[PDB]
């Protein structure tokens, strides 16, 4: 009887330890997911900025070529 109850106490402490580990891991996982989605948003914004810069770039190149032709 006492042997079974000691087994029960060991099981309880092991369960509590594993539950704490699971809680910590899942909280960290949620933080990682939030971080990942926000940095993906940032990367998309960077892509848009790069495209706009490229369009401005070839506009400027067009102007340069026209002035070169006039010269």
């Amino acid at each position: 009887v006492k042997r079974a109850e000691d087994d029960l106490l060991a099981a309880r402490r092991a369960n509590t330890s594993l539950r704490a580990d699971r809680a910590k891991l899942d909280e960290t996982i949620s933080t990682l997911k939030l971080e990942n989605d926000m940095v993906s948003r940032q990367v998309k914004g960077s892509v848009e900025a790069r495209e706009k810069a490229l369009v401005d770039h070839d506009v400027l190149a067009l102007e340069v070529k026209r002035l070169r032709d006039i010269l």
Binding site: D58, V59, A61, L62, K65
Partner: protein
């Protein structure tokens, strides 16, 4: 009267924007396709020099919605003018010259 004159101004602006945007897009495409043509000419010259000097033994030039497919075809052609064959040849040749 305000909204009538605004309507007239809107029509004039519509015409002006149509002409300006079409002209600008056409001109920029023409300029940049001329640029890429110059670049591919340079690539062909480099390929000819490499073959005839190092290891060619023979070198041979190539031959030469709707707008979307046309442009895709054009870019695919001008990027596939030089083949994976030649790219691997150049890489292995570079290593061999190093050693």
């Amino acid at each position: 009267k305000r909204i009538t004159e605004q309507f007239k101004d809107l029509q004039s602006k519509f015409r002006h924007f149509e002409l300006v945007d079409t002209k600008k897009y056409k001109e920029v495409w023409g300029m940049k396709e001329a640029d890429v043509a110059a670049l591919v000419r340079q690539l062909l010259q480099a390929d000819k020099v490499l073959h005839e000097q190092q290891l060619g033994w023979d070198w041979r030039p190539p031959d030469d919605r709707r707008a979307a497919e046309r442009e895709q075809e054009f870019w695919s052609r001008m990027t596939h003018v030089i083949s994976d064959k030649h790219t691997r040849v150049w890489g292995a040749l570079e290593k061999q010259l190093e050693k």
